[PDB]
């Protein structure tokens, strides 16, 4: 074996982050479609078959790796109703260079999930079993979902208390608000995020309706509400939210965009938290997010300023 034979071989190019995996920017619309092209390189006379294939033993190890006994904490394989590849491709002699077309459709993924697709790109060849991970054999795609309202919001201002006292008991710097449709998101009370094993009992939903509370002014309705019954959810306030923009004075391609929510006041219960007790809390404030876009780049190669992500 030589280092060179290795590297006539085909790759993946991607650049991942810092859990192993290239995260992909779907908006969820009136439908969560999204082509993703995953780049191929040829490091090195003939027309090349190349075969792509769900990866069945990457997640297992990759979630070991990245996060030990914590299986909360893992990716799921992403169902095969939620994409399509084609599982073959012809490279011609002379072109370095291929793209793999994934067809991403997440209407109605669970996006309190952490969902991936691991894809292996071989050559129908035993040298593809060897140092996979140094030749970048694999990749790990991981669908970020996100709409209008959805993303990384300040939660500072959202006060978590006692039921019944004002005494500030916990507060988030940030919250985030995980994507149902292109209208509806959920954020988790009690300090939950996608990090917490009982985050699902936790989930609260918001409805960013169309409909002005006055037809006067530019605040718009909200709907909130919980699905499980043993959070004890009662709220107090139907939310509302005001959406601007403006251009940057200097960076003149640059827009902000502010997504303002108030009113929220909410009773709800702990119940998992401290064995074999409940604690009854409050959340009221409100949440906001300031969203940077270069106007010049497509809302999915936006970098975190955007916040969706």
Same mark, same amino acid.
């Given at each position: 074996?030589?280092?060179?034979?290795?590297?006539?071989?085909?790759?993946?190019?991607?650049?991942?982050?810092?859990? !192993?995996?290239?995260?992909?920017? /779907?908006?969820?619309?009136?439908?969560?479609?999204?082509?993703?092209?995953?780049?191929?390189?040829?490091?090195?006379?003939?027309?090349?078959?190349?075969?792509?294939?769900?990866?069945?033993?990457?997640?297992?190890?990759?979630? #070991? &790796?990245? #996060?030990?006994?914590? =299986?909360?904490?893992?990716?799921?394989?992403?169902?095969?109703?939620?994409?399509?590849? =084609?599982?073959?491709?012809?490279?011609?002699?002379?072109?370095?260079?291929?793209?793999? =077309?994934?067809?991403?459709?997440?209407?109605?993924?669970?996006? @309190?999930?952490?969902?991936?697709?691991?894809?292996?790109?071989? &050559? *129908?060849?035993?040298?593809?079993?060897?140092?996979?991970?140094?030749?970048?054999?694999?990749?790990?795609?991981? =669908?970020?979902?996100?709409?209008?309202?959805?993303?990384?919001?300040?939660?500072?201002?959202?006060?978590?208390?006692?039921? !019944? &006292?004002?005494?500030?008991?916990?507060?988030?710097?940030?919250?985030?608000?995980?994507? /149902?449709?292109?209208?509806?998101?959920?954020?988790?009370?009690?300090?939950?995020? &996608? *990090?917490?094993?009982?985050?699902?009992?936790?989930?609260?939903?918001?409805? #960013?309706?169309? *409909?002005?509370?006055?037809?006067?002014?530019?605040?718009?309705?909200?709907?909130?509400?919980?699905?499980?019954?043993?959070?004890?959810?009662?709220?107090? @306030?139907?939310?509302?939210?005001?959406?601007?923009?403006?251009?940057?004075?200097?960076?003149?391609?640059?827009?902000?965009?502010?997504?303002?929510?108030?009113?929220?006041?909410?009773? #709800? /219960?702990?119940?998992?938290?401290?064995?074999?007790?409940?604690?009854?809390?409050?959340? +009221?404030?409100?949440?906001?997010?300031?969203?940077?876009? *270069?106007?010049?780049?497509?809302?999915?190669?936006?970098?975190?300023?955007? +916040?969706?992500?």
């Amino acid at each position: 074996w030589t280092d060179e034979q290795f590297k006539q071989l085909i790759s993946f190019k991607t650049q991942p982050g810092g859990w !192993g995996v290239t995260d992909v920017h /779907v908006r969820y619309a009136n439908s969560a479609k999204y082509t993703y092209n995953l780049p191929v390189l040829v490091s090195g006379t003939d027309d090349r078959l190349v075969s792509f294939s769900l990866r069945d033993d990457t997640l297992d190890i990759l979630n #070991f &790796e990245k #996060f030990g006994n914590r =299986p909360e904490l893992y990716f799921r394989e992403l169902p095969q109703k939620y994409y399509s590849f =084609p599982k073959e491709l012809t490279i011609p002699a002379g072109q370095s260079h291929a793209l793999l =077309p994934i067809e991403f459709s997440l209407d109605g993924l669970d996006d @309190s999930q952490k969902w991936a697709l691991p894809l292996k790109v071989c &050559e *129908d060849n035993g040298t593809y079993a060897v140092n996979p991970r140094k030749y970048y054999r694999t990749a790990v795609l991981r =669908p970020i979902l996100f709409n209008e309202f959805s993303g990384r919001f300040s939660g500072s201002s959202l006060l978590g208390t006692m039921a !019944g &006292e004002s005494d500030i008991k916990f507060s988030s710097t940030e919250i985030k608000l995980n994507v /149902v449709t292109d209208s509806i998101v959920f954020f988790y009370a009690g300090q939950r995020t &996608e *990090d917490y094993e009982d985050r699902i009992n936790y989930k609260v939903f918001l409805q #960013f309706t169309g *409909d002005k509370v006055d037809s006067k002014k530019d605040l718009y309705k909200m709907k909130i509400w919980a699905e499980n019954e043993k959070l004890k959810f009662n709220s107090y @306030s139907t939310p509302t939210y005001k959406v601007s923009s403006e251009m940057d004075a200097t960076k003149t391609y640059l827009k902000h965009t502010y997504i303002v929510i108030s009113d929220i006041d909410f009773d #709800f /219960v702990d119940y998992t938290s401290v064995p074999n007790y409940e604690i009854e809390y409050n959340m +009221k404030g409100g949440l906001s997010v300031s969203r940077d876009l *270069d106007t010049r780049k497509p809302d999915e190669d936006q970098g975190s300023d955007s +916040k969706w992500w």
